[PDB]
Design a protein around this ligand. Sequence first.
Ligand SMILES: [Mg+2]
Ligand SMILES: [Mg+2]
Ligand SMILES: [Mg+2]
Ligand SMILES: [Mg+2]
Ligand SMILES: [Mg+2]
Ligand SMILES: [Mg+2]
Ligand SMILES: [Mg+2]
Ligand SMILES: [Mg+2]
Ligand SMILES: [Mg+2]
Ligand SMILES: [Mg+2]
Ligand SMILES: [Mg+2]
Ligand SMILES: [Mg+2]
Ligand SMILES: [Mg+2]
Ligand SMILES: [Mg+2]
Ligand SMILES: [Mg+2]
Ligand SMILES: [Mg+2]
Ligand SMILES: [Mg+2]
Ligand SMILES: [Mg+2]
Ligand SMILES: [Mg+2]
Ligand SMILES: [Mg+2]
Ligand SMILES: [Mg+2]
Ligand SMILES: [Mg+2]
Ligand SMILES: [Mg+2]
Ligand SMILES: [Mg+2]
Ligand SMILES: [Mg+2]
Ligand SMILES: [Mg+2]
Ligand SMILES: [Mg+2]
Ligand SMILES: [Mg+2]
Ligand SMILES: [Mg+2]
Ligand SMILES: [Mg+2]
Ligand SMILES: [Mg+2]
Ligand SMILES: [Mg+2]
Ligand SMILES: [Mg+2]
Ligand SMILES: [Mg+2]
Lengths: 167, 260, 131, 188, 155
Amino acid sequence: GFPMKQGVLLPTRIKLLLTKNVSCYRPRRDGERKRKSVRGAIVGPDLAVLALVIVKKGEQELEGLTDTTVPKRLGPKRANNIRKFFGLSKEDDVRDFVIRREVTKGEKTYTKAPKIQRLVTPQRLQRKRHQRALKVRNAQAQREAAAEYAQLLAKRLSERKAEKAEI
Amino acid sequence: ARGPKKHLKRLAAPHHWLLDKLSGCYAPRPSAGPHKLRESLPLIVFLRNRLKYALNGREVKAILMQRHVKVDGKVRTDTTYPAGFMDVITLDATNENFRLVYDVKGRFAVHRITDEEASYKLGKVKKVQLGKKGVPYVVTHDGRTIRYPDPNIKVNDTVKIDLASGKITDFIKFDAGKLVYVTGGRNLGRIGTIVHKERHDGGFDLVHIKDSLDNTFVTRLNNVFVIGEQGKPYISLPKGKGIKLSIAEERDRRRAQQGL
Amino acid sequence: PRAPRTYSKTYSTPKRPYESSRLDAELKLAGEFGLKNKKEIYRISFQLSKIRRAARDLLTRDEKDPKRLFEGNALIRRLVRVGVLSEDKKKLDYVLALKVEDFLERRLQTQVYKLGLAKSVHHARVLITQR
Amino acid sequence: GISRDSRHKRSATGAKRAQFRKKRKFELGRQPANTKIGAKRIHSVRTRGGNKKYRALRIETGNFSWASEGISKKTRIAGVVYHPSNNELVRTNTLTKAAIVQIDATPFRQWFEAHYGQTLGKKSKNAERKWAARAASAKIESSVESQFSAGRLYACISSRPGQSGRCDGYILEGEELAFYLRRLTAKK
Amino acid sequence: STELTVQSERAFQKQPHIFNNPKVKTSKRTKRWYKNAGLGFKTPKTAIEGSYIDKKCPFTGLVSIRGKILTGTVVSTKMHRTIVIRRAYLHYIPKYNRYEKRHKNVPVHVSPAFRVQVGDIVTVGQCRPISKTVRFNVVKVSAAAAKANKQFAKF
RNA sequence: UAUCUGGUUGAUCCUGCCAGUAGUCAUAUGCUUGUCUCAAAGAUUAAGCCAUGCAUGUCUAAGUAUAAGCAAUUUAUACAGUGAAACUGCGAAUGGCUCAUUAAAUCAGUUAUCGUUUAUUUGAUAGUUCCUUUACUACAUGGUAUAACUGUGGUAAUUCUAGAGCUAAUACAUGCUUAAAAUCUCGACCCUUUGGAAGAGAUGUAUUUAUUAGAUAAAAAAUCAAUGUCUUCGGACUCUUUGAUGAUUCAUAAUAACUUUUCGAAUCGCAUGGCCUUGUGCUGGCGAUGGUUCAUUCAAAUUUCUGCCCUAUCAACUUUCGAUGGUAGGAUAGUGGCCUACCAUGGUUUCAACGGGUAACGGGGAAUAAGGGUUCGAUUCCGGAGAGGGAGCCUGAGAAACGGCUACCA
RNA sequence: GGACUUUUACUUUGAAAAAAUUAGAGUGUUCAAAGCAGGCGUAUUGCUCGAAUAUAUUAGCAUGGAAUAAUAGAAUAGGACG
RNA sequence: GCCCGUCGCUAGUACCGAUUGAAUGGCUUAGUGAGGCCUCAGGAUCUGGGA
Ligand SMILES: [Mg+2]
Ligand SMILES: [Mg+2]
Ligand SMILES: [Mg+2]
Ligand SMILES: [Mg+2]
Ligand SMILES: [Mg+2]
Ligand SMILES: [Mg+2]
Ligand SMILES: [Mg+2]
Ligand SMILES: [Mg+2]
Ligand SMILES: [Mg+2]
Ligand SMILES: [Mg+2]
Ligand SMILES: [Mg+2]
Ligand SMILES: [Mg+2]
Ligand SMILES: [Mg+2]
Ligand SMILES: [Mg+2]
Ligand SMILES: [Mg+2]
Ligand SMILES: [Mg+2]
Ligand SMILES: [Mg+2]
Ligand SMILES: [Mg+2]
Ligand SMILES: [Mg+2]
Ligand SMILES: [Mg+2]
Ligand SMILES: [Mg+2]
Ligand SMILES: [Mg+2]
Ligand SMILES: [Mg+2]
Ligand SMILES: [Mg+2]
Ligand SMILES: [Mg+2]
Ligand SMILES: [Mg+2]
Ligand SMILES: [Mg+2]
Ligand SMILES: [Mg+2]
Ligand SMILES: [Mg+2]
Ligand SMILES: [Mg+2]
Ligand SMILES: [Mg+2]
Ligand SMILES: [Mg+2]
Ligand SMILES: [Mg+2]
Ligand SMILES: [Mg+2]
């Protein structure tokens, strides 16, 4: 049952050290590496199963393969991905082209759609308006308190020359 | 040993909490905050052990989560949040306000204060540096950064603060003859004026203190917290005004009030 | 990891084990106040022993010294409370005196007998232990 | 790991110390960047508590400052000619702080003759006026001006390449320049 | 030990960031920096007047003096630029209610502003670790030479 | 709570030990055992070995739901309740346990960081992002590639997983933006002066280097090179601005540049209101999660002074292959022979070094009660060390982690 | 703020100081070992005393003393004040 | 009367001692040297020089 592993070369097994983002290993823990056996990528009589993928079709239909066609499971969910699984130009409105999957509640047929993300909406623009606001507002605030301080200083100098001219 | 310690064994807990020996194993460990672990009074201690308001610890979270309790003006929801000397504890319901201020036995007192007095606090400025952009700042004993203070403000002076807004409305310089509250050592909670400081370059200036019983005693500077003029304190002091009576004196007073 | 439950023992035992004089002297005490143990005498003579120790130490200090005046007076008022020390002899040079029978005389078993109620000191024991 | 503890190592008396505890990581050390010349190639090492150091291995340019002229340019680093710690750094042209290098001069030349209108070695309006302002100030220095013919200048790496990813320095000048020249030739 | 040479290393000896612009014709060749260590310790003139470099000098170099201030009695002036003093002290032993002579040697750096020699009493100041063993820096000589000059030929 | 007694002789007085006597938070064992309360407990020998179960997981209105999940109703045809799985985040460095090592080590009391790193909590903190700056850059918001899942499978076997097909973000990877002003360098022109000028670029923070300011020990003058502001055109400069420390090349700022360019919100929940030129325009409430820098708090690492049991049937020790110091570097979070290269010859010791032993973790403390002492502390709190023995390392703020991984040994 | 100070031991008083343990105050856990409680009323919408003190010695710090015991001083004057 | 040593018996302890005897633990020369980490290369594939 040990698996093949692209790009070992070798037609035998070996025991490698694997990491995150790698074939034949799912790390149980962060930073976990485990040392596991692996089968090489060169095919040999010892293989229980070869994994093949049709690239171009032959001259005649293959039973449960070319003759049957299982559909995708899920459809576009991010705003622009809808705009491209239909080709839409951001003017067409995406709420309409979202996919709809019927389903039965015995004698009630219900209907559900995703939840478009990255959807530009008024609610989002209200927040982009507010952040911008807050920086400027603060920036001006921070200047006044600055200027107000210079005053405390500049009319402290007008008291050090009311001191140095009294005595 | 590998990292921050997250528990507090009872007995390792500071005494001025007055936690009982048995009935557990641990005490609450004061969260990271504005006051130091060893000089703080967690909410759990205050809402339960002092005010008797909740019985369960669990019940203290239930009181708290309703945003009943609020410290120095802000709501505060942490069970073990570190409350500290000079802070202000308000109960919206029960219309009660409290200041955290020391006994004489060195303990945190339960001390009711007005709705008005609860508007502001006092802070010992602990350092005064020149910040970035050249903006000067002061930093007070409860970790407040206040930008743009008075030049005449320097380290050890105490400071009046709006709470409601973060600002400074006043300051008192550390000068021979200014009301002092002692915050550390076995003279913690004593109160009285200042006679004169010993200098000592490269270690621990000494602050010679005298109260309103013509009593005298010393502490390290660091442990001295200015709070007004003799007479005029900028906050209300706890009953007994931190004067410290002899064991005999105390005995006598208590067996003086004897006749029911 | 839970706080030590503190405890103390409350007796001392005769240095010399077979002193015929001490032995008789102890029995009569029992026979008189209705004790069952030598320990009931032992326990008391231990209580006594410390009090003397306390008092002895105090006396060494200066007359009108704070601790002496504080804790000395405390010790006196407490002995008075139970009626071991008489009112006249109220100054600890006498708590320094003070024999065991004084203590003995103030037990609930002994008082329950002294005026009425019991008639014989043993009947006194049994009544008490019997609610 | 390399461990910068003291608890190996004999006591001042010269006694042998037992081992007490194992290597902690907080007393760790790592290996030398041994940074060389040519082509950018820098690797970041993750140091204590977040925090990167940039380990330069191979470098070809650095930013070099002509102190007395109060400017700094980017130049090629022609490369290592003297090093007080170990000569293998010189023979292997290795870049570390304190190393004496050779830089390029073409940026420092272009600046000068543009700022002074004088040209080293051997008609605008404002510029003319500007140049006339300066001078009596362009009188440079015998043993620096002569380096420009060669098109190479002596400079002292002042930064830390295996730490900061930078190989920066100042041109050599006056007294200190006199030093390294004397060593350079009285060794030649 | 320093003595003479001064520019005597593989590297050029200088005070960091103390730049002498060659363009500006100067009458002192080298701009030289120095501080006042503090705690009322005079920075001696030989520090300012000198031309040695020594980055471990508490007046001309990059060290702060803070912590203990210690005084001992010089015992070793064999190692270049650092000395070793003996700190004598009597140790109290309760059961016998008497004392016994003890001592410790303490290695300490010594700036060529001072010229110290065996027998001299020296006040030294605690600083950051300067070497494997040295944690102090010498800051005032209390001594002199121990009446050496009155040891010449016959009358 | 300052006590002694029995035994050498024929008898005597001594010396002197053996024996008795009393306690032990001091273990075992024997016999005996009714009640209240209190409650230690596989330390000692073997830090020997371990069957099986359990001891670390975690969700708020508020990161991610098309469960082909449950519930239906209640406005909700993008989504909206509830919610497995999974991603993402945070935690697993706390706790608990043991005393093997350890004898200037640990530890204690006392110091230091002007010698560093610090998730978090708390408080401060960001108008600068583009481009030779009119035929313009997605901001009404830019890219895919993946779990779960569906489906095809492999092995006797495990918290093994392969080939195929989908789809999300506060995961991954990108990438726009805002007032005014001043100061700088350039400089087309015109005109000879005392010379001045349109307009052009550059200036967030962070990084790295070099430079400069950061005064003050009480007062005054002349001259060289540049070159400021105001002219009563010989000239004057009149008031001139300064933070902290015992102490700094400190805090902070200024100049010329540097960077495979750090940060500068493409995020989420509640409410939905004003406002006119009616653009679904432009505005706008409360608070979540973020975010760079500084402070604070929880810490950490090193660190000064002094103090340790027996031992000379251990007297010299230390530099092989660093032993003690200097210079430079490298490495580190950072000091430092920590490591390297050059160079030197130093460092410790009868005031006991160095070596050996320890049935040695250090401390708070425990037992014994005239006092002085003597003995003990594996063990409820504090510190340290470890996880069968060694070494190594990934993740991370923090581990040289063991209920993490890698290798060797058993 | 400048300019400079012969060294030490001893003793004094003081600061800095974890708790539990120890000594010890207050409180009738029914007694007691303990515990840090508890106590008063209008016992129907509360009043109130507490949670002391001592010790903590060596070393380091800070202060007073000037006996006891060391130390250094001016003799080839290279002396002291100006 | 006391009493000393060889010589003889039982039993016990420790010593010397061919075996260049044995065992456990701590360091350690020389040789061999796993592994991860750093680094010179590499390039299954998978994209815009990088990974
Ligand atoms: Mg979204
Ligand atoms: Mg907590
Ligand atoms: Mg300090
Ligand atoms: Mg030497
Ligand atoms: Mg006999
Ligand atoms: Mg006889
Ligand atoms: Mg006879
Ligand atoms: Mg005996
Ligand atoms: Mg045990
Ligand atoms: Mg065991
Ligand atoms: Mg749903
Ligand atoms: Mg632990
Ligand atoms: Mg991709
Ligand atoms: Mg991100
Ligand atoms: Mg000046
Ligand atoms: Mg200043
Ligand atoms: Mg700086
Ligand atoms: Mg609207
Ligand atoms: Mg031997
Ligand atoms: Mg060195
Ligand atoms: Mg030698
Ligand atoms: Mg000896
Ligand atoms: Mg041991
Ligand atoms: Mg021990
Ligand atoms: Mg112990
Ligand atoms: Mg043991
Ligand atoms: Mg460990
Ligand atoms: Mg085991
Ligand atoms: Mg080994
Ligand atoms: Mg491990
Ligand atoms: Mg563990
Ligand atoms: Mg004292
Ligand atoms: Mg106490
Ligand atoms: Mg390398």
